[PDB]
């Protein structure tokens, strides 16, 4: 049950909004069972002031038939060349409930992302690759 | 970057206005501080219901400014409620390249009759000096570029 | 060299009148303190209903200015309620160059029968001395130019 | 030597204005 | 008492929703950190599309709120692009009086599926202590008041 | 004793929402 | 007072507009720095060609005015090129009388879309506290009295 | 040839302009010869910078049959009661030509005029009384 998701945000420097806002994604699934719907809820700004200067990336289970879903999610960012970079993996099998989000608040420094020498923001477009394994 | 069974493409639509605004015989500004030389309204082809103008005070707008040029941008007509935009002003030089370019980092909100600008735009003595040549033949040329951000749209394409 | 989708142009209209006023046998000033020698009214073709005149006091306007010849510009006829102008007085020496040319930094507001000029214009002793050459053949050749400013108009261009 | 569009030759007898005008 | 020829009245309309949410058998919260107990969606009869709900975490969001019961307000359904509201959460005691009432001074911008609330709403040990009386019969009663602000209109009643 | 317009009685067995809204 | 043979009664015509503005639930001003809440256009019966409006920023205009209410007067339309007027703003109390009334001694030139007002009109904490009674029932009533001066006219009556 | 002139300005506090301008009167004369025309010129603020806080007042000869005219002028202010107060004259017989202004720049302090206790500005109306005698 290895889901995958390559979601792209263009003209990202025009982030359009202030502190603590969300950029919701399209609900994605696999062909089977197609009854489990997930969406990446990214915040281009920090989610909290406790750890600001961060691209807090979350995974939310929007639709589910069962009471709970045990899933391991892994986010990553593609560079200009396109390999997997900043691959951050959640080690536990997190429990998911109807309308529940888990993810990495301290995902990546915004200052680290904003340098052009890193190549992590090519053509003002960022590509998030998320893999979800359901057990 | 492996193959994704599903992908998305969020498009935060942006539109760009480009404006040149020329004042001849600028030394004959003819009035004291607080005066405003309004500019003719300008827009793009789309949506063309949004009308912007440049408001410039040849002298300082505030008591702290005095010897300062202040350049503002005003939205005179809006079909929506509010419009968020980033504006960048730059005084063109005698040869023609952009000098003294100062931009607003935040996407400022805009309503009808609401203006945003830089009171501390350029030193007035810097502007009036002949050596740097920001006022060639008593002409002041301001180039203003406005980027208006729109709502995001997701196309939601699912792969094999 | 940026390219602007919309361009504007604001032109502030300035009209320049010039006047060369010579007074023969000036040393016979014929009167003491308080004398005003008026000049014949002058104007250009446009708009030809703005009539100005020059008014000089050869001795001086007031007791601070006994040794200071004072020259004044008087707007005798004007159609509008308010006229704004900037004046420059000068004196032509024996050769013909301008000498002691002093200008107005501000654009003063003029009205019917209002005078704005430099009371502290020129030393009397500097004028009468022959080695200075400012009084050739006893003829004081004053020379004035006034730039009157009008309200600006926006051309309001647009390109595509 | 600057030029003007209007003249005024005020002559004081030993005061009238000739007021010649350049055209 | 000054009589004015012209009057005006700018009325900003506030819509107030109120919510009483009781959770019986609270001590058997059945889950550790991270658990969210959603409430049934509630609304008032003002266009009946602004549906709100309350999300409580009986343990807390994170390690800074281990002993802090968080309580969030979530706007599930809304007609407009954004809604501006100010919310107040309180707890009822055995006598029914409000206790531990706290509110957000700002008017927060709400959107489709956005939660604005107090992570450090109440001490856990304060709540479970029986002498405090905040948990009568293992039932946690929460009171919520939401005031939605909308765009104002002008009446402008001209006076004789 | 404050009064509310909408109620919700969540019961946990030994979790369903009654939502006894005031009519 | 002996009887003069000739007299001249000069009338500098002045007109007076009075304005009362009421804002209900003012604490729900709903926006931060820079927000302008305009007022309905007001005028007198004669000549009814001069159209003004009030404008207030609840938080303030500039960094000097964080804790300062700012009230401004704006001439939204006028057929003449310029209008000179003196404006006086005041805030009524709970009992209804004037409080913290402060006025402008100088008459400012007004033009199409020009504002003149007091950025530091009243301290925000002074207004927001309950003891002074300056915000009764969350209502802020502003009384604006403006006086427009006109050109003088001489009747020139002659006696025996 | 003793003229007289009661030249009144109402709502004077709404003085309509800043320092350095003139409120011109209408031309006046006597029945005989009715050819010599005079007019007062009063500057509500100071005429010149050192005057500033001053109410300068002048007499101007607009129309004259002869070349040069000798005249003694005396200005005064009529108070709330109506008597002649702050009356000071020009002892010298001043000489007048076509469009010549003679008078007092230092005629009265603006601040001394502006007290309500003095009564020199009743009902925002000021009453200049000018008496000029031609010899």
In 3D space, the residue among G12, G158, G8, G11 whose CA is nearest the CA of residue H26 turns out to be: G8
Backbone φ, ψ for residue G37 (5° rounding): -105, 105
Chains near F, with 3+ CB pairs < 8 A? E
CA distance A120 to A107: 13
Handedness of CA G107, G108, G113, G116 (dihedral sign): negative
Three-class secondary structure of residue H123 per DSSP? helix
Chains near B, with 3+ CB pairs < 8 A? A, C, G
User: Quick count: other Cβ atoms within 10 Å of Cβ B61?
Assistant: 22
Exposure class string for E22-44: b at 16+ Cβ within 10 A, else e: bbbbbeebeeeeebbbbbbbbbb
Three-class secondary structure of residue G65 per DSSP? helix
Q: Tell me the residues of H at the C interface, defined by beta carbons under 8 Å apart.
A: 21-22, 24, 95, 97-100, 102
CA distance E25 to B48: 60
CA distance B151 to E82: 12
- Between chains, do G28 and E149 touch, taking CB under 8 Å as contact? yes
Whether the CB-CB separation of C9 and C155 falls below 8 Å is answered with yes
How buried is B46 (Cβ within 10 angstroms: 0-12 exposed, 13-18 middle, 19+ buried)?
Answer: exposed
Shortest CA gap C108–chain D (Å): 22
Beta carbons within 8 Å of B101's beta carbon, 6+ residues apart: B88, B89, B90
For residue C151, give both structure tokens: 């309200």
- Structural domains in chain C, CATH included, are 17-148 (2.60.210.10)
G123-G128-G134 Cα angle (round to 5): 85
> Would you list the DSSP string of A89-134?
E--S-EEE-TTEEEEESS--BHHHHH-TTT-SSGGG-EEEEEEEEE
Whether the CB-CB separation of E85 and E148 falls below 8 Å is answered with yes
Alpha helix (H) residue ranges in E24-143: 124-128
Whether the CB-CB separation of A7 and A130 falls below 8 Å is answered with yes
In 3D space, the residue among A20, A50, B11, B149 whose CA is nearest the CA of residue E111 turns out to be: A20
CA distance H110 to G30: 49
Beta carbons within 8 Å of E36's beta carbon, 6+ residues apart: A97, A99, A100, E55, E56, E57
Nearest-CB residue to B114 (from G36, G111, G114):
G36
Element of type H or E holding G13: strand G6-24
Three-class secondary structure of residue H131 per DSSP? strand
Backbone φ, ψ for residue G112 (5° rounding): -60, 115
Handedness of CA E88, E91, E97, E101 (dihedral sign): negative
Q: How many helices (H) and strands (E) does chain A have?
A: 1, 8
Instruction: For strands F6-11 and E14-23, give the pairing.
Output: parallel
Q: List Cα–Cα distances, A95 to A70, E56, F13, in angstroms.
A: 5, 17, 21
Documented resolution in Å: 3.2
B138-B139-B145 Cα angle (round to 5): 155
- Between chains, do C19 and D11 touch, taking CB under 8 Å as contact? no
HSE-up of C94 (CA within 13 Å, CB side)? Answer: 10
User: Quick count: other Cβ atoms within 10 Å of Cβ B121?
Assistant: 21
Tokens 């205009």, residue? G61
G and D make contact (3+ CB pairs below 8 Å):
no
Nearest Cα residue in chain C from B145:
C4
Beta carbons within 8 Å of G152's beta carbon, 6+ residues apart: G10, G11, G12, G13, H16, H23
For residue E148, give both structure tokens: 């939605």
User: Quick count: other Cβ atoms within 10 Å of Cβ A47?
Assistant: 23
Q: Tell me the residues of A at the B interface, defined by beta carbons under 8 Å apart.
A: 3-12, 14-17, 23, 25-26, 28-31, 78, 82-84, 127, 129
Chain A residues near residue B8 by CB distance under 8 angstroms: 5, 7-8, 25-26, 28
User: Quick count: other Cβ atoms within 10 Å of Cβ G106?
Assistant: 8
User: Given 3-state DSSP classes, what are the helix, strand and coil percentages for chain F, each rounded to the nearest 5?
Assistant: 0, 35, 65
Nearest-CB residue to E84 (from G24, G30, G37):
G30
Three-class secondary structure of residue E50 per DSSP? coil
CA distance G62 to B61: 12
Q: How many helices (H) and strands (E) does chain C have?
A: 1, 11
Shortest CA gap E159–chain F (Å): 40
Query: How big is the C-D interface in CB pairs under 8 Å?
Result: 62
CA distance G158 to H3: 12
Whether the CB-CB separation of G76 and G119 falls below 8 Å is answered with no
CA distance B114 to B112: 5
Nearest-CB residue to H30 (from G1, G5, G10):
G5
């Amino acid at each position: 049950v290895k889901f995958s998701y390559m979601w792209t945000i263009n003209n990202f420097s025009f982030c359009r909004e202030e502190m603590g806002e969300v950029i919701k994604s399209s609900t994605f699934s696999s062909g089977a069972n197609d009854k489990l719907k997930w969406c990446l809820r990214v915040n281009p700004k920090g989610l909290d002031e406790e750890s600001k200067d961060y691209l807090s990336l979350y995974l939310l289970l929007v639709s589910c038939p069962k009471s709970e879903v045990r899933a391991k999610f892994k986010f990553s960012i593609l560079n200009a060349k396109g390999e997997e970079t900043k691959a951050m993996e959640s080690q536990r099998a997190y429990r998911f409930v109807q309308g529940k989000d888990w993810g990495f608040k301290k995902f990546i420094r915004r200052d680290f992302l904003l340098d052009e020498a890193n190549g992590l923001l090519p053509d003002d477009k960022l590509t998030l690759f998320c893999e979800v394994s359901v057990v």
